[PDB]
Amino acid sequence: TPPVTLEAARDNDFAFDWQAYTPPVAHRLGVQEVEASIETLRNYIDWTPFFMTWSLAGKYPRILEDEVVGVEAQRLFKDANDMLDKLSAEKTLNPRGVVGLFPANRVGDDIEIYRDETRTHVINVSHHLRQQTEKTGFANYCLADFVAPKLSGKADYIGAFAVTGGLEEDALADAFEAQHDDYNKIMVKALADRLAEAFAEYLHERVRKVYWGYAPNENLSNEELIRENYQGIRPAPGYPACPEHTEKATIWELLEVEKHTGMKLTESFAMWPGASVSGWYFSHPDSKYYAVAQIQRDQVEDYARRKGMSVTEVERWLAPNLGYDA
């Protein structure tokens, strides 16, 4: 669909009656280091992407009884769970994370994150982009729209997290590599990835039920979790609703991620360990995933100003989303 101006997109923001709504208050404000054992996380694994990593099609568990790939899938599953058993018993891969909840309000396309409930001093701003093509029957979405506008005077909140399958991932993979054991190098990396993603799923449930606490009686099966049958989202920088990777630096500062977990950011703002997930938490019932997609020069320049960056800098970080030749 054809581009619209930045002002036209903002005039089509998510429509919601904030005066009639009470955002749920975060029960546990502040930052908390967390850990999770392999025994705990293995009940939150989504196995279907594991089999995709091994080039097998089909959803788990039905893939195990498949007529052509089932026997191979069963052997992969057995080797995977034997390796989880060993990693668990030997404590050689140790998932870690950190979670935080903060007072927050929307201003424009950004989310102000406050030091405290006086909502004066801003400790960080979470910057977001807005869809910028002609939308029929939908808002031009921006993740900031899911937090109450500061002008509404409603007390709202935002969360953030960072989790990893464990800092030991490289040492375990590198040992298999030195042995020319490609199978087990792929296996331990695929397991660390499942453990990181399982930790993201588990911690999000902890946030909905307890840390934020807006869904204390939620009782979903793992299959229902995989289907996202809960209220709220956990969008991650680099994914289509928030594609701009340098916002991971804001999460790293907000949560003191490196101090609490050992996890690091590269110059490309990739996470280390490789098996890592970081992102935000939104509680709003209408919050959903979508793609920002292609944006125009006016929004690039505005984003640069808000970020304290030059236009040239931002055109690097936003290159995949530029709707024009830079």
Ligand SMILES: Nc1ncnc2c1ncn2[C@@H]1O[C@H](C[C@@H](N)CC[C@H](N)C(=O)O)[C@@H](O)[C@H]1O
């Ligand atoms: N459009 C989007 N914008 C932002 N984050 C997204 C988007 N789509 C997916 N995500 C993120 O990706 C997650 C979904 C999956 N990657 C992870 C769970 C899945 N069961 C798996 O193991 O692959 C979401 O919970 C978000 O953190």
